[model samples]
Target: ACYSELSVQHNLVVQGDFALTQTQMATYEHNFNDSSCVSTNTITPMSPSDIIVGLYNDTIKLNLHFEWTNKNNITLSNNQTSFTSGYSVTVTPAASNAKVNVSAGGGGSVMINGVATLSSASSSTRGSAAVQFLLCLLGGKSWDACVNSARNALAQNAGVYSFNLTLSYNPIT
Candidate 1:
């Protein structure tokens, strides 16, 4: 078992065409292949772990300034800008082999060319968060019991997980 974590941060400046992407792959192998198992040759389908994939924590922040120009290289003022609070996403597993998940969100201001068009600083997904917590409580145990189970799992299988964060900036006209 091994525990690993990686993070990178930068103040980036970009112009023209740009793109960025981040990903984490949580691979799990069951021990059904062990020769001692009576059903070694039989195919058994089940989740490898109780908590298959858990996003411990994630965050992002950006302050952007854009300069738009026409084909003649002349500055185009009063462009368009918009901003919104970051929101989380949850893509549940499609099958036993589906083990990868992603978490992302951020908040900042945007200006169109030279005029401040829109901006948002508050996250609007708290209702989703509350609903998820309620759903987790449907497991038939009290809140304390569920929390204890989560705490124990993290301590025992902490080494089996990985962490990563990536940041990128791109500007296109």
Candidate 2:
């Protein structure tokens, strides 16, 4: 036998946070006097952890460890009915200032389970909120103004950003 394991394990970690959109600002500014929230490109950063929150100001800031508990059955992963259960990987997300690592990748449109706590400013100030609080902090002015402050934060990329992860498997039992 080439190997002797029941299944494989996958893990990942990342640095920095993600940022936001133009239409959102444009939509926001029209009510004031309207630069159309256009005229220039802007970036509003959001944290990775900020995205997965349930509520409580829902502010975003993610420095994460993307992890998986893997033991595959074959049937559980596919669309077909099977006499055998498919392989499965459990998705667990964490943000712990610690770095992340991943060996290798996706099943489909999956709804994973995650939890949130009262941490962001709004969570403390307003007691709770359900919007991107980092951005809201600057909402004192029009969106262009809001976006300017966001850009000053200088995280990276446009409001949208991403990373790559790969997962491979070899089995023995």
Candidate 3:
């Protein structure tokens, strides 16, 4: 009955984690001819809401989007493959002015690039830095009650659980 209250809530909670593998880049370049690359790592809950029940159920999703470009403009022969614990994005020709957009299901919308529609629009262009903002929004009010309850429950009865981007390019040959 501890999660009964949370079960009734309709709001969702979200969080993100990002990492860059520079070392891997060298290997990829030598073996796959990939030169410059950028990746975004994200982890989010699999369920609609139920923090306590969700964590125990292994309801977390992992996403890694790697955008890499090859030196030759020629596409890698085998473009896609799955990586351990995650997967690799196929090597695509380099693109300029990549943009990212995020929304928290509320009226709030965060844009990473392109023209700003509003005078004071919030932007999470710094992928990793943006995580905290999303988490704060996700953890506000009703959700906090669930998180606190889940934390308390773990000790009392149940258990609980827990990028920046920029790319500079050179003139193409």
Candidate 3 error regions (>4 Å): 1-141, 157-159, 163-173
In model 1, what lDDT does residue 57 have? 26
Q: Write the number of the candidate with greater lDDT, choosing between 1 and 3.
A: 1
Candidate 1 C-alpha lDDT tens digits along 8-123: 12222222242232322222121111122121121111111122221222222222222111111111123211111111112122343433122222311111110111111011
Q: If the candidates were sorted by their TM-score against the true structure, best first, what order would they fall in? A: 1, 2, 3
Task: Give Cα-based local distance difference scores for all models.
Answer: 0.22, 0.21, 0.21
Worst 10 residues of 2 by lDDT: 22-31
Q: Choose the strongest candidate by TM-score.
A: 1
Off by over 4 Å in 2: 1-38, 50-159, 167-173
Cα lDDT tens digits for candidate 3, 1-173: 01111111111112211112211121111121111111321211111211111111122211213333321122112322111111112212222222212212222212111110000011222232234334643655343443333334332321111211112112112
TM-score of each: 0.19, 0.17, 0.16
Model 2 lDDT per residue over 16-99, tens place: 121221011000000111111222332111222312211112122222232212222111112221111112222223243322
